[PDB]
Amino acid sequence: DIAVLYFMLAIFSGMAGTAMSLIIRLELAAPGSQYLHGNSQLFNVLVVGHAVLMIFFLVMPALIGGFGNYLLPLMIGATDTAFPRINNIAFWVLPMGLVCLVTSTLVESGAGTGWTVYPPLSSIQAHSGPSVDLAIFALHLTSISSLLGAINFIVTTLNMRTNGMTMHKLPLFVWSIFITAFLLLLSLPVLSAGITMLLLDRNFNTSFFEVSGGGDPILYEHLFWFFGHPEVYILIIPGFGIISHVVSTYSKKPVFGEISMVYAMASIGLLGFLVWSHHMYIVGLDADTRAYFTSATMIIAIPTGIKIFSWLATIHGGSIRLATPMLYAIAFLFLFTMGGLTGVALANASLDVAFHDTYYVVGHFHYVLSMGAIFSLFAGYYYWSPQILGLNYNEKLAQIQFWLIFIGANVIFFPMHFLGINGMPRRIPDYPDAFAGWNYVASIGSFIATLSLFLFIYILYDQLVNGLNNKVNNKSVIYNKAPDFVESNTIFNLNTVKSSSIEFLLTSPPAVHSFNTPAVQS
Amino acid sequence: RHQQHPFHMVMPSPWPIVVSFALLSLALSTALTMHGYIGNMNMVYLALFVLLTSSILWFRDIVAEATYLGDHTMAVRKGINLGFLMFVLSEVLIFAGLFWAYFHSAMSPDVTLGACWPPVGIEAVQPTELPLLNTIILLSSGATVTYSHHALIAGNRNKALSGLLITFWLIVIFVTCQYIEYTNAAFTISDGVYGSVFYAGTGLHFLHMVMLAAMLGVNYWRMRNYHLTAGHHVGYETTIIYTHVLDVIWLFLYVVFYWWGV
Amino acid sequence: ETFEEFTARYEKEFDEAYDLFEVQRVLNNCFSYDLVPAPAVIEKALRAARRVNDLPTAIRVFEALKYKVENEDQYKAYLDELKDVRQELGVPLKEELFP
Amino acid sequence: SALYLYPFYAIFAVAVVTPLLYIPNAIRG
Amino acid sequence: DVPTPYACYFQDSATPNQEGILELHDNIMFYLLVILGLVSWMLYTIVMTYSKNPIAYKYIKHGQTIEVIWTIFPAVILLIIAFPSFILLYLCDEVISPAMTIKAIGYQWYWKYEYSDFINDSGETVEFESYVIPDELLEEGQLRLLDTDTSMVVPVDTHIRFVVTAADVIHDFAIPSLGIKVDATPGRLNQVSALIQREGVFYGACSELCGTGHANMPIKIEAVSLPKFLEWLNE
Amino acid sequence: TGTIKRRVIMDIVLGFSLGGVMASYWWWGFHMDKINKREKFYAELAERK
Amino acid sequence: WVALPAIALTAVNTYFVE
Amino acid sequence: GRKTPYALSHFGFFAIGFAVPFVACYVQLKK
Amino acid sequence: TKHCWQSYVDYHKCVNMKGEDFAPCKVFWKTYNALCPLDWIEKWDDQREKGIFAGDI
Amino acid sequence: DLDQETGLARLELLGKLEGIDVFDTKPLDSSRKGTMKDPIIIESYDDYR
Amino acid sequence: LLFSVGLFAVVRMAGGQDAKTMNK
């Protein structure tokens, strides 16, 4: 259905975003080498094209909606997504925004001013290169399209619940992206209102986030925070669902703590809205207010810790089978524990006053968001891809892609925790002379990681040629070897095509109209 | 007996309306960003008109699916009801964004340009001449449709048409009165940090209400072709009342500027 | 939950063998718990292996206890009692077989 | 019917042709 | 002090502010590193020492009381990690002590300063606009992109307040050698009270982006004693 | 109980111990290097004016 | 019915004031 | 096609998707 | 000090109106010279000579 | 609302007053053996369900 | 990894700071 083009546009935009990574880091190698435009002419335009194109165009559609519109109805048992007309709306809205964003890059000067476009004089003074209106419209359509898919996923896992599943033992990806869309509702239209406010300010000269008229930019600063903090929780929580499923099926289908897991995910969904706070702790709010803020970011750090202790208990005591998605899950877990550690580090009160807009926070958020989200999307593709695409994915090249990604991204984003505390500024085009050390090996690592992306492209072209002696069966047979089936059902569905080893039983590729008969749980 | 799945299907992905709405939104992008700095006055109105027309085409095909082909059932009824009842709670957030923006601009005083809010140079309207009629006309709108609903349940036609048409002819009068209020206002969009937060938290209702009048004009054209019936609960039948709850929360906006603001 | 009610309950469930994959599935799950299997359970296992007309699962239970046997001393003790049980069974060690 | 869908298809066709004619003026001034 | 190539830590602490930040930073890094040693030993032991046999253990989603034990354990980690955060915020936030006032304002490519703690013998509030040094004007001895021509000069052992605003896309001055970070908003002002420990020129840079000239905005400050600041006439 | 109970107890307790000794030698070594170097430098600048 | 009619009559009486 | 149903459209499609930041950067550096 | 607007209005609603000795207003004059900028005094003197300065007077 | 196309609203009203539901809403767990000697019975308007 | 590091070495090393002596 929508999923195949939905994934093709994600890969297109991902190679565009890695090209932006290539250009930005190739400039950041040595002082003033590759590009003469060390200014917001072309360079801050490149970092905004990079950031907003890649977060909005890659992790957001593939992680929520691709696995959503292909794998939420197939895991809950639904025929199609409950409003089949507006997935089609939202996804065809998306590449019009890709055209809108590349038009924002192309025009005369370029008002690209970072992905978090702060008002005070991003105003009509910058609109001789009026790009930033096109950038905020591309973000506005991506905003409403993710909203539309969020409503669709909520209503699909509400009314089209197949008579198997009650609300007490639900799958983790299903309940995961239900919490994700239920969390997306409560944060999207606030920033839609902020888009139309500041667009009215920079078009029809009423200027309430700007300087004149006593306009105050801190209202917008609260607004885009209040959107962008649950935005990154949208960025990670279906990733937690996918990591739960791969940690399940490659080691041990008895996983640790389901009801505890879904309670912890609802705890993250509760406590994740009301701390927009740490992102500009520094600005000079009140002391009791910022102390309450610092205290509550610790309590948003608790339940994710409970979840990763649960998966730590899960991989323990199970027959691990080190395929490529199990390597993705174990690398996910190791790097995300350290990223949440540095989260607690930045989460303190009196340390953002030394850590804001430096490369220490940059290494931290690249660490959690890049490692977590892209390792989860890696696990999702190399996990569900022979089911949907019907072809086996040449396991040895998947192994070398994993190792090459791991060492490349690690040697990129580990030196930033050294470059940051010494006092690098953020989005610096030309850094001082005493910072030339670690950016060189960061550039080496960026070429390593884009080589691994090109290796992924050769694997994606190798998805044509039906290897049989490379990868056939996840969760190899226990003690049987003469009987042949998918070897695991911890609840006894086994109805027609749905079971407890959920949706591995459709066919390869699944039919254009599956689910004729309603499934049942034991 | 030959049976089936209760939830239904539509025309497949090569469908002109999903490409139409998307290329339309790209035309709206080019309109809003090329009239703003190169100056094409004609086609932003063309983009708004083609948006309205494609919305009515999309709506006409889905109401053809509703009644002219007869697809929806009780599960799909509860699904559309719950979806566009959670759409109310989604609208509460974009509401509360402007609500909290004005709450911050009035609770925290800007030390320049009238530290007391409303500022020195801008004077608010007295809430007793026209707005005392506005709260009561919204209260009557919210008070007579809950009897119009029992009138539609009871099966008669003249009483339901009476309550319905006095409600919505009355709110056409409300469209005219809000137009004359925010025409006769002295301070404008370009004033303070007060003007285009107050005019924003009235123009949102202006946008919602012209969309509301379009939606109920098409609802009445649907009513006059014997489409809707008191047993015809198809799914559009229940999505017509919740804008009264939206007007109750509009009254909740309305109260924060009169009793607590000045 | 304890040792003895486990032994009784799953020997009662275990004399419901009647088949190849049924006895192999109940061998799998009754072997995969968090306790070492009783010698009476493995005597019923070998007798059910005689009932279901299959020899290599009667080899497979022995390498399964060779992994799970948690030391070498209990392994030699099981080799003794299971050795004269083999003399009344006829099943070989893998270490006696060399595939 | 479709007798109004044909001129609507026409005005949509020009409404998605002419902004693509607008964008070289947007890049070239 | 100054950044250095291949640097592990940050610059030298000359404030009780940076002494407290370094102390609390080593505290939180200590708790972070016991948690990292934990999870590294866990993942190595599980993945390597569990080669396996093809059975997985039976026990399904459970473990109530020992699981809630290791959910109560992060809470005591938070309390012990957050009490020094509370005492250091209480020690750092207050500004009541009498202090010299120097005020800054920055317009997209520079800063300028004003000395009005003490109406001097001339009685005039002074100004100087701290611009940059471009490629042609390079003193080859001094270091590039931290080159501010007209330095701040501040007496040692003196409480100093930075009561700043800005315009013209706004941004923030941050000197990581002494640890300052404020808003410099167009309409709102804020202070930060800080003495200094030693003498010596201290270097900083601009945190928040302003746009086409976010690169070329260096920020420095010189630290002298009381009589050398007393001799600093023609301010 | 059995082997998996013995292994979770020994494993988590030795993980506590190894993380504790890694961060304890780290904090002792580097934090005492800080107290030596910085308190000696402040001793020079204060006791020698 | 009584919530609609008499309250709407009082509404039309209060509307004629201003 | 006769030579490219999807044999080169993957390579060429990704070449375009990698090369459009290059031509955007080129026309923005030319200004 | 806190709410610099109150300090400025305190010694600006001095000798213009409310004829007072120059020393208690001079205390707040010295308070405004520190702690509060000097470039914007041209702006909030233009606001006063225009007559739509935000002070109550 | 009778005599309209697609009488799926018939058996909601019909099954509402007589019991037999419309679109086989009901679940199943017959507390069985799962054994090939007596498997769970399969009823369909087809040979595969 | 060798092809990545070698490609990095043979793409660009040109036009940096003034001189090592200037740093001194």
Ligand code: HEA
């Ligand atoms: C999906 C991405 C993602 C995720 C999940 C997080 C999660 C967290 N982030 Fe981060 N963060 C970002 C992405 C993310 N962040 C981005 C993009 C920015 C700003 C950049 C900008 O926008 O430009 C940012 C900014 C940011 C700041 C702003 C500082 C500044 O601007 O300089 C801070 C400070 O508090 C912070 C902290 C945290 C914390 C505490 C968590 C916590 O949720 C993590 C908690 C997890 C655990 C703690 C790990 C598991 C537990 C243990 C291993 C065992 C027990 C240990 C403890 C509980 C003590 N984040």
Ligand code: HEA
């Ligand atoms: C989506 C998240 C994401 C990812 C993956 C990356 C990946 C990379 N980023 Fe970026 N980056 C951001 C999001 C991301 N970044 C954000 C928000 C900013 C801040 C912007 C600013 O504030 O202006 C930023 C900023 C940023 C900076 C500026 C620092 C600043 O001042 O803050 C630099 C500097 O060179 C940089 C480099 C890189 C590099 C070399 C990679 C490399 O890791 C790239 C190599 C990785 C890949 C190979 C992944 C390929 C992925 C796919 C194609 C799809 C997914 C999976 C497949 C199916 C293959 N990034």
Ligand code: CUA
């Ligand atoms: Cu401001 Cu740089």
Ligand SMILES: [Cu+2]
């Ligand atoms: Cu955050």
